[PDB]
Amino acid sequence: AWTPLEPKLITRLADTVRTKGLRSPITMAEVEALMSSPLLPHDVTNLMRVILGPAPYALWMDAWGVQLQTVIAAATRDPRHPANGQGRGERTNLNRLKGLADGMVGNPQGQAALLRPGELVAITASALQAFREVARLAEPWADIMQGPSESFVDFANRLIKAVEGSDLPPSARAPVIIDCFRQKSQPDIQQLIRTAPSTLTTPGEIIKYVLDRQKTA
Amino acid sequence: AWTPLEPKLITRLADTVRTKGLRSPITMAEVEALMSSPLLPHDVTNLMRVILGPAPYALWMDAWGVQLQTVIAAATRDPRHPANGQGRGERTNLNRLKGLADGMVGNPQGQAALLRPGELVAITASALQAFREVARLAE
Amino acid sequence: PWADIMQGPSESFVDFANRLIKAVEGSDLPPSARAPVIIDCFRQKSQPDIQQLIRTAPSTLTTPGEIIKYVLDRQKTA
Amino acid sequence: AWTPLEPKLITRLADTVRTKGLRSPITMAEVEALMSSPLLPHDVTNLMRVILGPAPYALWMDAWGVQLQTVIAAATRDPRHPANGQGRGERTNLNRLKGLADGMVGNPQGQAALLRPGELVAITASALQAFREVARLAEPWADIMQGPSESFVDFANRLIKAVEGSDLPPSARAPVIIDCFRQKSQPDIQQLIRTAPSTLTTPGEIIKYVLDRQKTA
Amino acid sequence: PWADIMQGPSESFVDFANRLIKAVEGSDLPPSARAPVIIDCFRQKSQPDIQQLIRTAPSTLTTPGEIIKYVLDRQKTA
Amino acid sequence: AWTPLEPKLITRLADTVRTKGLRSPITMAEVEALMSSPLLPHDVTNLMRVILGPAPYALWMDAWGVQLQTVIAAATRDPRHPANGQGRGERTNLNRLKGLADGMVGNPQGQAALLRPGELVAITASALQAFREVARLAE
Amino acid sequence: AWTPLEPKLITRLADTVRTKGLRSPITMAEVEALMSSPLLPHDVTNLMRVILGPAPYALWMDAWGVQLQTVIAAATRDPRHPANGQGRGERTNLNRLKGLADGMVGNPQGQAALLRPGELVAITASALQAFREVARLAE
Amino acid sequence: PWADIMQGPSESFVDFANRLIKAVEGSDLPPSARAPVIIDCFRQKSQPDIQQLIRTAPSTLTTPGEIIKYVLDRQKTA
Amino acid sequence: PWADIMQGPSESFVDFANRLIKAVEGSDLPPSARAPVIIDCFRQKSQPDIQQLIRTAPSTLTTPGEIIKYVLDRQKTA
Amino acid sequence: AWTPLEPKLITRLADTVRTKGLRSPITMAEVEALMSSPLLPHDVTNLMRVILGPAPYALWMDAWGVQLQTVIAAATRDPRHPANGQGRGERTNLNRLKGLADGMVGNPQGQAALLRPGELVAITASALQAFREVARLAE
């Protein structure tokens, strides 16, 4: 049996997206919260229709389709998908994932009837990844310098923000943040990091060291 | 079954940290309040992601790892840890504490399924001590 | 009126796209005529820098979402 | 039977190291060339004594010892090392690797007699890695800008050199080179790359595009 | 003579293209050598504003008609 | 047998294009008039050479090629094209449409010999659409 | 059995490229000289790594990939390629041409073992054409 | 003479180390007395910036190679 | 009074340490509170050159004797 | 039975350290003189408290602890230490060396009762080496 999400929670989430934006960690946490139980295509579609504006909604439809297509390629690459079955008669078409299949168009009850739990969780993960892509797309690290009067924690916050909210792979953020701490961060802190008797191999360790030995002023 | 923390409480706590700072006794009291029920690694990780800035979040990840490593050393020093079991097959690895083990990465439901209550309270106490360290360090 | 919408000299492109899609979808056009009109309004409105940016598209853009994505990628940061 | 390396090749390699330096790719290629056949500890030791100065030679002795110690730790962690044997009587001590064991000190003939081919190749790989470490140590990408009068191929050469000869992981060089092409490379080329109707996802493709559409001047 | 044709300081681009194509096609060149010559004369004649406009073409123009279309699109209205 | 168009009509049409322009409805009507009987590639090519200036003629050659390529794509998408035949040996190549095929280059008589009426009407419609495109583009 | 090229010849060729440039006829003659025996992907890759700067090396990798792709298209267009075999099990993938296939990555001995002489000569001709393209492009 | 070697105000550290190790190893000292002398000459020569850099070493450096590596890591880039 | 002791601009560090340890041990503090107080007074008194010298200690100093030894090693000879 | 050192000798040694310094050979000779009979931890501790200033005394406590720890490592590396016994019940802990063990804290008589002569000579040699280290370090 299908139960809709509370319009109160949806209104609160919409106002959160309206004030904080799409990319804030609080907004992503709230979306993860409302993305806890496996949702039917109807639920996610209406949710994104309500919380997102028109242009972000178009972008999100595109991204969701692309991610679902990647999922269906992986599904035809492995007959053991939790959305698939063992025989060929349970193969899952994109009409069944997007809610376009027979007996599902516009009807959430029938949707909940015919859909598999693996189908639901795959749709949900796809929608979450698409939301992440669109949020990263809707709103330069190598141009960030520590100002002459700026403190170091503000500079570190700004730099980590710009590096993590960029187009770099996830495995290339820490080395870039370290090497930007070393070459930016005006020459007093540059020499402070250079003359480190220990080897600092993490942005957190560099931040701790600099905060300990910084010139109080 | 996993239930997320209210984004309203999280928003209020984030604004508290924003105005009062990390070290005020009211902020530590609020953190203790939102640290009442044993949280899953997913919950604490997202909470610190939201309430802390980028650099304090990096520092907190470091400190949390160190404290969890101390906990795991004490656990291998005593087979009667509320996170451990009696046999060797229940020994708790850091992948299970940080939420990196199999069946847990990114999934809070599976996390809540496989985790022990002793595991949860140990993770929670470790995160609280790490928050205290980072707060004492930032200012 | 959708046919009177221009991208202001100082307006960003996402605001212009929002306003245009709003006015086109909330109008008297048939549902099957909104996407071509939105595309052809992106091409002829949207002041000549973005006009030339869309014109010199090595790929063929056949959807408002694709045009928006392309323009957001290659736009002149300012 | 031990055969020494030609002093003519060694003299040419020494002059190469003297003019080009320790870190040039031509120098590393020449070292790889003279590091082709498995060398005895005597050979590599004398080679580094001749081609390297005193201080780089001290650094190289240190690094070679450390790498050989890592090798011996891996050897005691696996009894199937091509330097080891099956029984415990064939376990290889560092005195046998550094040429300090009995019947080997100062005598290359006896050295070649008692040493294993696996021992030789392990010593050789260790010495090569130590040479790489010392070369990287003896002599900043995020500070590289394209000068107002500099051409683009010179800027690209300098940037790729400084990025590949740095402390970044191998999987983080291409994204960094791309994002440095985009943010450095003074605003004419910045706008030229920004308004690319195609998506450029490789430094070579960016270089080709810019060379095609650059402002001839 | 085709190799002596320059775009005057005040002349428009369509007049220059007409004159150049006329002089190149009504000359002693083989038929298979007219298009490359017309292109390379568009690139080296056609005073430096249009020269830089053709140089900084994100797409590769491989036909006199395509070059003419591109220049007519992105030309400096004056 | 090939019969050329009157140079008097062509001169009048050229002066019409010279005074009224390319886009006037009277000019398009006159072009439709002189585009009544199916013309051979030689006829249309010389007609556009005479009535159009050099730069519009280059643009028109480009547009005509593009439209003929679309026609040939539709032809390979349907073996029942009035230019095609039933077997594969009657498939129409662009060398036969542009008049570049064997036995046609520069010779209008041989052109009229080997060409099909469907070929002629397709070439004519393509040339008309290309003229419309260039006229809309020039001004 | 794989034998490496002399570092003396490679050093002389690198200095030739450094003083004369990429496009001089003497440089192309020297490259043709060092391109006489069919080289393994390892050999050509290291050779271009040493003689070319970073940016020309990136350009050359691009051009070499494109030319090898054209070769593989011609190979799937003709089952009688000296790199191909008669059955479908000998069809040559780009991982085998670029040296990325199984048993070849980083190992020149295994490379020389599994590669065909037709494969080697095709790789060599592709690399030579790519060098010509990059030399014509750089200056 | 090894005991007269000083690091010049403008000289780099690797040149000074090369010169010092050369003069110490090509001298009349016993082989077992070269490393301690090289270390104690690194510490007392090698103008006071590097002197303080070696003095404030959280680790104990017991080899000329280790001292050279440490100084090359933490040296003042200039 | 121990909490009023500062290292003078011209005073050496061993004299300051002697005076501070004297005043702290000859005071009303419990015996278990003297070492932490002496350490935290070394860190906050002892004019900013030595303050920064103690701050940038690659090792953790957890005893007044260790702090004194470290400072005496790495002090600015003057 | 414990007999204290003469305060006259201690006063003379303190004035020697005050005028000649810590490193003079006469001072080291005087210390060796007053370090002739094996002293109890109480004796050496009070002696260094009197003759050394506060900061050298802190340094000396550190160095004495380190040297005693090296001694205890050598003792656990050899069960035939003159401070150790044959069985495991005579193993000497650092609380017994520094005078911190049970029945010894603050009482020199009980100290002299329970301590071994090997313990006394090891403590004495450790204290002498620590004094040498601190003297070499202070100036």
PDB file of all heavy atoms in Angstrom, chain A residues 82-118, unseen atoms left out:
ATOM      1  N   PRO A  82      19.355  -7.091  -8.248  1.00  0.00           N
ATOM      2  CA  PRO A  82      18.182  -7.169  -7.363  1.00  0.00           C
ATOM      3  C   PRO A  82      16.910  -6.635  -7.996  1.00  0.00           C
ATOM      4  O   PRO A  82      15.818  -6.898  -7.479  1.00  0.00           O
ATOM      5  N   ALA A  83      17.016  -5.889  -9.094  1.00  0.00           N
ATOM      6  CA  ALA A  83      15.841  -5.511  -9.864  1.00  0.00           C
ATOM      7  C   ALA A  83      15.456  -6.565 -10.895  1.00  0.00           C
ATOM      8  O   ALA A  83      14.270  -6.692 -11.215  1.00  0.00           O
ATOM      9  N   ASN A  84      16.422  -7.331 -11.399  1.00  0.00           N
ATOM     10  CA  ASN A  84      16.193  -8.355 -12.407  1.00  0.00           C
ATOM     11  C   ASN A  84      15.651  -9.624 -11.758  1.00  0.00           C
ATOM     12  O   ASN A  84      15.495  -9.712 -10.537  1.00  0.00           O
ATOM     13  N   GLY A  85      15.353 -10.614 -12.598  1.00  0.00           N
ATOM     14  CA  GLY A  85      15.070 -11.955 -12.127  1.00  0.00           C
ATOM     15  C   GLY A  85      16.015 -12.960 -12.753  1.00  0.00           C
ATOM     16  O   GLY A  85      16.967 -12.584 -13.437  1.00  0.00           O
ATOM     17  N   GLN A  86      15.740 -14.249 -12.557  1.00  0.00           N
ATOM     18  CA  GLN A  86      16.635 -15.249 -13.124  1.00  0.00           C
ATOM     19  C   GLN A  86      16.331 -15.503 -14.593  1.00  0.00           C
ATOM     20  O   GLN A  86      17.245 -15.563 -15.421  1.00  0.00           O
ATOM     21  N   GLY A  87      15.054 -15.659 -14.935  1.00  0.00           N
ATOM     22  CA  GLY A  87      14.681 -15.815 -16.319  1.00  0.00           C
ATOM     23  C   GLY A  87      14.690 -14.493 -17.058  1.00  0.00           C
ATOM     24  O   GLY A  87      14.821 -13.417 -16.476  1.00  0.00           O
ATOM     25  N   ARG A  88      14.536 -14.587 -18.377  1.00  0.00           N
ATOM     26  CA  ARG A  88      14.545 -13.397 -19.213  1.00  0.00           C
ATOM     27  C   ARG A  88      13.256 -12.593 -19.094  1.00  0.00           C
ATOM     28  O   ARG A  88      13.246 -11.410 -19.453  1.00  0.00           O
ATOM     29  N   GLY A  89      12.169 -13.204 -18.609  1.00  0.00           N
ATOM     30  CA  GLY A  89      10.902 -12.514 -18.456  1.00  0.00           C
ATOM     31  C   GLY A  89      10.844 -11.503 -17.329  1.00  0.00           C
ATOM     32  O   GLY A  89       9.878 -10.736 -17.252  1.00  0.00           O
ATOM     33  N   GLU A  90      11.846 -11.475 -16.452  1.00  0.00           N
ATOM     34  CA  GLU A  90      11.900 -10.478 -15.393  1.00  0.00           C
ATOM     35  C   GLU A  90      12.871  -9.348 -15.685  1.00  0.00           C
ATOM     36  O   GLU A  90      13.138  -8.541 -14.792  1.00  0.00           O
ATOM     37  N   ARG A  91      13.415  -9.272 -16.898  1.00  0.00           N
ATOM     38  CA  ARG A  91      14.330  -8.188 -17.212  1.00  0.00           C
ATOM     39  C   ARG A  91      13.596  -6.855 -17.129  1.00  0.00           C
ATOM     40  O   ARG A  91      12.462  -6.716 -17.598  1.00  0.00           O
ATOM     41  N   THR A  92      14.253  -5.866 -16.528  1.00  0.00           N
ATOM     42  CA  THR A  92      13.616  -4.603 -16.177  1.00  0.00           C
ATOM     43  C   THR A  92      13.916  -3.562 -17.244  1.00  0.00           C
ATOM     44  O   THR A  92      15.079  -3.223 -17.481  1.00  0.00           O
ATOM     45  N   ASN A  93      12.866  -3.066 -17.881  1.00  0.00           N
ATOM     46  CA  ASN A  93      12.986  -2.042 -18.904  1.00  0.00           C
ATOM     47  C   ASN A  93      12.883  -0.655 -18.274  1.00  0.00           C
ATOM     48  O   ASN A  93      12.345  -0.476 -17.181  1.00  0.00           O
ATOM     49  N   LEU A  94      13.410   0.337 -18.992  1.00  0.00           N
ATOM     50  CA  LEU A  94      13.401   1.704 -18.491  1.00  0.00           C
ATOM     51  C   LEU A  94      11.985   2.242 -18.332  1.00  0.00           C
ATOM     52  O   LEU A  94      11.765   3.157 -17.535  1.00  0.00           O
ATOM     53  N   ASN A  95      11.020   1.697 -19.075  1.00  0.00           N
ATOM     54  CA  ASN A  95       9.633   2.088 -18.856  1.00  0.00           C
ATOM     55  C   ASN A  95       9.159   1.669 -17.470  1.00  0.00           C
ATOM     56  O   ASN A  95       8.320   2.344 -16.867  1.00  0.00           O
ATOM     57  N   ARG A  96       9.690   0.562 -16.951  1.00  0.00           N
ATOM     58  CA  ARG A  96       9.325   0.124 -15.610  1.00  0.00           C
ATOM     59  C   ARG A  96      10.069   0.908 -14.538  1.00  0.00           C
ATOM     60  O   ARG A  96       9.551   1.075 -13.431  1.00  0.00           O
ATOM     61  N   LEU A  97      11.268   1.400 -14.849  1.00  0.00           N
ATOM     62  CA  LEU A  97      12.025   2.175 -13.872  1.00  0.00           C
ATOM     63  C   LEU A  97      11.497   3.601 -13.770  1.00  0.00           C
ATOM     64  O   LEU A  97      11.271   4.109 -12.667  1.00  0.00           O
ATOM     65  N   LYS A  98      11.288   4.263 -14.909  1.00  0.00           N
ATOM     66  CA  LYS A  98      10.760   5.620 -14.910  1.00  0.00           C
ATOM     67  C   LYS A  98       9.268   5.674 -14.619  1.00  0.00           C
ATOM     68  O   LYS A  98       8.693   6.769 -14.633  1.00  0.00           O
ATOM     69  N   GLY A  99       8.631   4.534 -14.366  1.00  0.00           N
ATOM     70  CA  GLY A  99       7.200   4.517 -14.121  1.00  0.00           C
ATOM     71  C   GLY A  99       6.349   4.649 -15.358  1.00  0.00           C
ATOM     72  O   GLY A  99       5.170   5.000 -15.252  1.00  0.00           O
ATOM     73  N   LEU A 100       6.907   4.383 -16.535  1.00  0.00           N
ATOM     74  CA  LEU A 100       6.185   4.539 -17.789  1.00  0.00           C
ATOM     75  C   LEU A 100       5.571   3.242 -18.292  1.00  0.00           C
ATOM     76  O   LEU A 100       4.839   3.267 -19.289  1.00  0.00           O
ATOM     77  N   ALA A 101       5.845   2.119 -17.635  1.00  0.00           N
ATOM     78  CA  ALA A 101       5.361   0.832 -18.101  1.00  0.00           C
ATOM     79  C   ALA A 101       3.840   0.749 -17.975  1.00  0.00           C
ATOM     80  O   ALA A 101       3.173   1.647 -17.451  1.00  0.00           O
ATOM     81  N   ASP A 102       3.297  -0.357 -18.473  1.00  0.00           N
ATOM     82  CA  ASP A 102       1.859  -0.569 -18.466  1.00  0.00           C
ATOM     83  C   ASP A 102       1.354  -0.814 -17.049  1.00  0.00           C
ATOM     84  O   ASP A 102       1.972  -1.546 -16.271  1.00  0.00           O
ATOM     85  N   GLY A 103       0.220  -0.198 -16.716  1.00  0.00           N
ATOM     86  CA  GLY A 103      -0.351  -0.305 -15.387  1.00  0.00           C
ATOM     87  C   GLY A 103       0.276   0.593 -14.348  1.00  0.00           C
ATOM     88  O   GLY A 103      -0.059   0.475 -13.162  1.00  0.00           O
ATOM     89  N   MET A 104       1.173   1.494 -14.750  1.00  0.00           N
ATOM     90  CA  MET A 104       1.871   2.358 -13.811  1.00  0.00           C
ATOM     91  C   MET A 104       1.729   3.841 -14.107  1.00  0.00           C
ATOM     92  O   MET A 104       1.927   4.650 -13.195  1.00  0.00           O
ATOM     93  N   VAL A 105       1.390   4.224 -15.337  1.00  0.00           N
ATOM     94  CA  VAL A 105       1.433   5.621 -15.752  1.00  0.00           C
ATOM     95  C   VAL A 105       0.377   6.416 -14.995  1.00  0.00           C
ATOM     96  O   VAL A 105      -0.824   6.276 -15.251  1.00  0.00           O
ATOM     97  N   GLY A 106       0.825   7.264 -14.070  1.00  0.00           N
ATOM     98  CA  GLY A 106      -0.060   8.105 -13.293  1.00  0.00           C
ATOM     99  C   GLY A 106      -0.690   7.451 -12.084  1.00  0.00           C
ATOM    100  O   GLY A 106      -1.323   8.154 -11.287  1.00  0.00           O
ATOM    101  N   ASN A 107      -0.540   6.140 -11.911  1.00  0.00           N
ATOM    102  CA  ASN A 107      -1.169   5.442 -10.800  1.00  0.00           C
ATOM    103  C   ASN A 107      -0.107   4.986  -9.812  1.00  0.00           C
ATOM    104  O   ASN A 107       0.638   4.042 -10.110  1.00  0.00           O
ATOM    105  N   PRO A 108       0.002   5.609  -8.634  1.00  0.00           N
ATOM    106  CA  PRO A 108       1.016   5.165  -7.669  1.00  0.00           C
ATOM    107  C   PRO A 108       0.684   3.839  -7.008  1.00  0.00           C
ATOM    108  O   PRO A 108       1.602   3.112  -6.613  1.00  0.00           O
ATOM    109  N   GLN A 109      -0.600   3.502  -6.871  1.00  0.00           N
ATOM    110  CA  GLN A 109      -0.969   2.234  -6.252  1.00  0.00           C
ATOM    111  C   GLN A 109      -0.507   1.058  -7.103  1.00  0.00           C
ATOM    112  O   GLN A 109       0.189   0.157  -6.615  1.00  0.00           O
ATOM    113  N   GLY A 110      -0.885   1.053  -8.381  1.00  0.00           N
ATOM    114  CA  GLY A 110      -0.382   0.031  -9.282  1.00  0.00           C
ATOM    115  C   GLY A 110       1.128   0.023  -9.365  1.00  0.00           C
ATOM    116  O   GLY A 110       1.740  -1.047  -9.415  1.00  0.00           O
ATOM    117  N   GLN A 111       1.747   1.206  -9.357  1.00  0.00           N
ATOM    118  CA  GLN A 111       3.202   1.292  -9.299  1.00  0.00           C
ATOM    119  C   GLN A 111       3.747   0.477  -8.136  1.00  0.00           C
ATOM    120  O   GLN A 111       4.535  -0.456  -8.326  1.00  0.00           O
ATOM    121  N   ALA A 112       3.310   0.800  -6.917  1.00  0.00           N
ATOM    122  CA  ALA A 112       3.747   0.063  -5.740  1.00  0.00           C
ATOM    123  C   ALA A 112       3.435  -1.420  -5.839  1.00  0.00           C
ATOM    124  O   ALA A 112       4.144  -2.235  -5.240  1.00  0.00           O
ATOM    125  N   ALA A 113       2.391  -1.789  -6.581  1.00  0.00           N
ATOM    126  CA  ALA A 113       2.052  -3.201  -6.727  1.00  0.00           C
ATOM    127  C   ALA A 113       3.111  -3.948  -7.533  1.00  0.00           C
ATOM    128  O   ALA A 113       3.657  -4.958  -7.073  1.00  0.00           O
ATOM    129  N   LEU A 114       3.429  -3.462  -8.731  1.00  0.00           N
ATOM    130  CA  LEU A 114       4.256  -4.235  -9.651  1.00  0.00           C
ATOM    131  C   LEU A 114       5.751  -4.087  -9.401  1.00  0.00           C
ATOM    132  O   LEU A 114       6.523  -4.944  -9.848  1.00  0.00           O
ATOM    133  N   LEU A 115       6.183  -3.034  -8.717  1.00  0.00           N
ATOM    134  CA  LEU A 115       7.606  -2.768  -8.562  1.00  0.00           C
ATOM    135  C   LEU A 115       8.238  -3.688  -7.525  1.00  0.00           C
ATOM    136  O   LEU A 115       7.590  -4.114  -6.564  1.00  0.00           O
ATOM    137  N   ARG A 116       9.523  -3.988  -7.729  1.00  0.00           N
ATOM    138  CA  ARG A 116      10.341  -4.780  -6.827  1.00  0.00           C
ATOM    139  C   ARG A 116      11.048  -3.874  -5.823  1.00  0.00           C
ATOM    140  O   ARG A 116      11.279  -2.692  -6.099  1.00  0.00           O
ATOM    141  N   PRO A 117      11.414  -4.392  -4.647  1.00  0.00           N
ATOM    142  CA  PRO A 117      12.205  -3.572  -3.715  1.00  0.00           C
ATOM    143  C   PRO A 117      13.576  -3.215  -4.258  1.00  0.00           C
ATOM    144  O   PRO A 117      14.058  -2.099  -4.026  1.00  0.00           O
ATOM    145  N   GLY A 118      14.223  -4.140  -4.971  1.00  0.00           N
ATOM    146  CA  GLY A 118      15.465  -3.802  -5.648  1.00  0.00           C
ATOM    147  C   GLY A 118      15.277  -2.711  -6.682  1.00  0.00           C
ATOM    148  O   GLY A 118      16.110  -1.811  -6.809  1.00  0.00           O
TER     149      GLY A 118
END
